[PDB]
Every structure is written in structure tokens, then in C-alpha cells.
Amino acid sequence: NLKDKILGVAKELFIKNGYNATTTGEIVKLSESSKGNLYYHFKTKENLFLEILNIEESKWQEQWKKEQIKCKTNREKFYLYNELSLTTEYYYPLQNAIIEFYTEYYKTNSINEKMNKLENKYIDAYHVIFKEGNLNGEWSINDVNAVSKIAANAVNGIVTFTHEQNINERIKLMNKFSQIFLNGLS
Amino acid sequence: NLKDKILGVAKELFIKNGYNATTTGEIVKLSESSKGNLYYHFKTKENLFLEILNIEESKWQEQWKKEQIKCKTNREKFYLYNELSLTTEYYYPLQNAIIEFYTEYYKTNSINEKMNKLENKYIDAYHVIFKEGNLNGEWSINDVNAVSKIAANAVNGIVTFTHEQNINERIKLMNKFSQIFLNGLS
Ligand SMILES: Nc1ccc2cc3ccc(N)cc3nc2c1
């Protein structure tokens, strides 16, 4: 493909290097396409990027759903999303470039929106897990969206700022977190 | 001192033009030193920067040591510390140079090493709060180190990936997170 091979060469660079470090110039040399190509379907560079994120968030949200069946209760679902959060190959590997990208575009306006429309996807899983939990008496959440946002973000943190110490040390902590968090809800 | 003038000057240079942009040449002239002296004190720009970050860390600790008298109980110190982490980052000058530095150096294990020595120092604040909380029976934690690493990274997540929301909502969520987490410890 073309408008899909670019979307893939970019992802690899955005991850390997960073948001800025990777240039549309580069993208082309390893994806063979006139500069203009990147223009029709991808307007700005924060377009091609804000794009990939969508794909990633979707792919991950999908992987989770074809994977949460292994969890009988929501308490189990919560626990599992956070673990899987550490192993996926989706979305999370791009948290870094996201951090950078937001620092180099917070001064514009179209940023706060997209960078908040996608936030609704990001926290969805937690909203479902938490609402359903109320619909199932596992706990009693009055401020679900508050709790869902706090959860999502907290977790992203553990996943993102412990990226190095042996992969199982992470899974350990992550579970202690899911533990403590839930015990604090009810 | 001439070493400190270089640190001083370098810190500012970093604040105004960011990391990747500042050159040791500028640092040399503006601090009235030399390539040689700069080399003897830090070897490289990356180490120079790390040295600054260390100074910053100490200042922060010194500040915390004073700021925490306001919080009588450890439960209180936990709430306050997290609030501070969030509010101060809003106007931290070096923040940008840091984001630029990490998302461009987390690959090297040498610079990824010294970095954890630094992160550990941030984590200690939690460790102290938690250890001291035990000796007053505010809570009963048998895995302080664990909980401490979790809190540090949970909070950091809430700080880094929330920017889009208005400052009050952030402070509001962060306080809720401190409440849930502190509650799930009993
Ligand atoms: N990686 C680092 C190292 C030192 C730091 C020192 C700080 C001091 C005050 C403040 N508000 C934020 C800080 N962030 C740091 C982040």
C-alpha cells in the first residue's frame, strides 16, 4: 500500500527517535513518496502523527476486548488492563513522542481538542470497567469519569516511567497499584 | 565557582533555547571559561546537563524539607507533595529542556543509569512519608519501597498526561487520587 506504508514508516521513526527528531524528509527516503503525497491524506505533520495515535489507540482497544474475556469480574478486568498495558505493542510505546509533541504544540489551539477527543478513547476502558462494576455491585463509584481519568493517567505513568527495570518488576508493581487503587474505591 | 558560573550560565541557556539548541561554545564564552575547563568538569554536554538536574533535585529537596513543616501528619504530607508536584511543573523553567533531554537520551544505559539515581531521589520523599507514616500508625505498609515507587510514578503520570485540562480540574483530580490511594492502604 502507500497511504498505509507511510503511516507505518512514521510510527517506527516516531518510536525509535522522537516526534521532532523524525522529519517528513526522513519518512520519505524509507517510504518512497513525493513530499506532496504526504499532503493530501495528511495535512500537517501533527496530522500524520495525530493520525497514528488514533490507529494505535484503536488497535489497542481492540486487542483488549478480544482479551478481557479472560477476566470474569471487572475487578479482574481492571487488574488485567493495567498488566496488559505493560506488554502490548500498541499506543503506549508512543507515550514518549506524545509527551514531546504536546510540548511543541500546546501553544496552538487545534491541540487541546484532538489531544482531548482522543483522551475519551484512552479512558473509555476504565469508564466501562468502572460503570459496569457499579452496575454489578463490585464497588460504588460516584465520580466515574474522575476515577477513570485518574486511573488511566496513573497507569500510563507506571507503564511509562519505569520503562527499563526488568519487565517482571513492572508487572509486580502494576498489580500492587491495581490492588491499592481498588481497595481505595470501596 | 567558575564551575558554578558554568552551571549557572548553562542552566539559563538551557531554559531559553532548550537542550539540543544550546552549544558548549555559548556556555564557554558566556561563562568566560574554556572548552578545556568545561571538559574537565563535565566531559560532555549531556553530563553537564545531568549535573544541573542534580543541583535542581537538591534545591527541590531543600525546598520540600521546608515546605513540609506545613503538613503536620504524613497523610497531609502525601496530599501536599502531590499537589506541589503538579502545580510547580506548570511553571518549571527547565521542564522543556528536560523533556527534550529524556526523549532523546533514554536509550543510552550510562545516561539512563544516572537518571535513575536521580529519579530515586525523588522517590525517597515518598519513601520517607510512608516509613514515617508507619511509625505513627497513620497506615500500615510492609512494602514501603513498592508503594513509594508506585505513588511516584502514578503521580507523575497524573502530572504529565493531563496538561489539556484547566489547572483547577487537575488539582481536583490529583487530590482525589491522593484520597483513593491513601484510602486503599487500610
Ligand atoms: N528530572 C527532573 C530532575 C530534577 C527536577 C527538579 C525539579 C524541581 C522543581 C520542579 N518543579 C520540577 C522539577 N523537576 C525535575 C525533574
Question: Cβ(A74)–Cβ(A129) under 8 Å?
Answer: yes
Q: How many pairs of residues across A and B have Cβ atoms under 8 Å apart? A: 112
The yes/no answer on whether domain A50-186 falls in CATH 1.10.10.10 is no
Ligand 1 centroid–CA B119 distance in Å is 10
Interface contact B61, partner A, CB < 8 A = no
**Domain locations in chain A as residue ranges:** 1-49, 50-186
Amino acid at B37: N
CA atoms within 13 Å, Cβ hemisphere of B2: 12
Sign of CA dihedral B102, A157, A14, A37: negative
Interface contact B94, partner A, CB < 8 A = no
Largest CA distance in chain A: 57
- Distance from B73 to chain A by nearest Cα, in Å? 19
| CB atoms inside a 10 Å sphere around CB A176 | 15
Domain made up of A1-49: CATH architecture: Orthogonal Bundle (1.10)
Nearest to B157 among A106, A147, A154 (CB): A154
C-alpha pair distances (Å), B119 with each of A113, B45, B48, B110: 32, 20, 17, 14
What is the DSSP annotation of B6-62? HHHHHHHHHHHH-TTT--HHHHHHHHT--HHHHHHHHSSHHHHHHHHHHHHHHHHHH
Of B77, B130, B157, residue with least CA distance to A158? B157
Of A74, A90, A88, residue with least CA distance to A181? A74
C-alpha pair distances (Å), A147 with each of A61, A125, A157, B13, B164: 19, 12, 15, 40, 17
Ligand 1 centroid–CA B160 distance in Å is 12
User: Angle at which helices A74-87 and A45-65 pack, to 10 degrees?
Assistant: 130
| CB atoms inside a 10 Å sphere around CB A26 | 14
Interface contact B44, partner A, CB < 8 A = no
Residues 6 or more apart in contact with residue A43 via CB below 8 angstroms: none
CA distance B93 to B81: 19
| CB atoms inside a 10 Å sphere around CB B17 | 14
CA distance B42 to B113: 16
Which residues of chain B does A173 touch, with a Cβ-Cβ cutoff of 8 Å?
146, 149-150, 153
Residues with CB under 6 A from ligand 1: B 53, 56-57, 60, 88-89, 92, 98, 118
